[PDB]
Symmetry: D2
Subunit: 112 residues, 4 copies
Amino acid sequence: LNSDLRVFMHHIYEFEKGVRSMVLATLANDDIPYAEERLRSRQIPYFAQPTPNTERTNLFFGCKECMEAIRLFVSGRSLNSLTPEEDFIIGAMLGYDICRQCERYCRRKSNS
Amino acid sequence: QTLNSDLRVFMHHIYEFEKGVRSMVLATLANDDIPYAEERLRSRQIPYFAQPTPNTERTNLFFGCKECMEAIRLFVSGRSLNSLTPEEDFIIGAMLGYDICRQCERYCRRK
Amino acid sequence: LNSDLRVFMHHIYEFEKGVRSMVLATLANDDIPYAEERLRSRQIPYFAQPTPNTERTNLFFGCKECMEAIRLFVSGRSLNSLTPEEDFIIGAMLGYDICRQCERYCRRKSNS
Amino acid sequence: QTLNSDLRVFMHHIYEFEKGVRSMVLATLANDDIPYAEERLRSRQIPYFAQPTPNTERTNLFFGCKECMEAIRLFVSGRSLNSLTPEEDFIIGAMLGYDICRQCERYCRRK
């Protein structure tokens, strides 16, 4: 079990205790089968998004409702190409403080 | 106490915000009641943003952290809450303290 | 529908949208049947606690797990007789900010 | 990056705290790693409380809001995390950002 994976497992423990409603883990393509097996053993919903120009995959996991949501606007897009609104909602799903998210939304709207 | 149900809820929401249950509150109040409401908010140092309503003799009074006050000014000013995109809708719900998995489902339904 | 009840209904709307995991409403004994019916229509778990020396009842509602929890230490006791620990956990169940709760715990431990 | 998995998680937790996902973090680290960890925390202005561990060459490093730092000093100092009452256990979990309904169930099991 490599470093990326030891860290993924830690995220699983936190999701189970209900720290947050969604997690994003970036892993090597080769480590994705194993990561997904660990999620399936626990019945934790997930959505994998391969990154076109790498051998790395964004593995989202969390409540089913947010898996269904991230598919409707993250599918086939880059995460750095999200609107300030889409970014707010990603951060909120990830468990970020809302006032914090309100601040970076304003910053996106102002800093441009 | 000696206040109407709208204002009891309004005060209740002031307590929630003060207890940190949520970052923003939307209160809708009769226009004769907002001088009192704004006095309460100013007294407690609570940032707010007032705006009109489809139903004329009422005012939407948002209050909460200054961060979200500045965010809502940016997308709610001059606009009905029923005219928002699904993404705008999620953001507003998230700011009001609504469960994020619930928001995801609602988003999926609209979208 | 009286003032206490118009306000209770508002709490129901907030619980449904998932603002918090538990709510406490204090109502007249006479208004409790109606309040409980509204909770049952929505399948919202609840626990009523009559207040001995009044005609008022503390109606807790929220997730089943916290209903089962408040029964193990609130049953047959006054809410103002809770330890600083029990108070922390009540506030946390009610959705209060945790740093806030850490502050009032310290204050209970210090202010005595 | 060039840091070990414990420290990547440690940094990750620093980001969570900074993003306001949770009010407190418990990191358990090898003793040679805590000078670095404390430097990171001091640099970012993050309050912390270090304490020993059943497993000798390791240190429990709690960090988070000053409010909860003062709370944990009060009931964790000199004490193993496995010696806590069910109520103490709930409080610690709540401070770490654990779902409150989950905490209620765990509390019921112990109690």
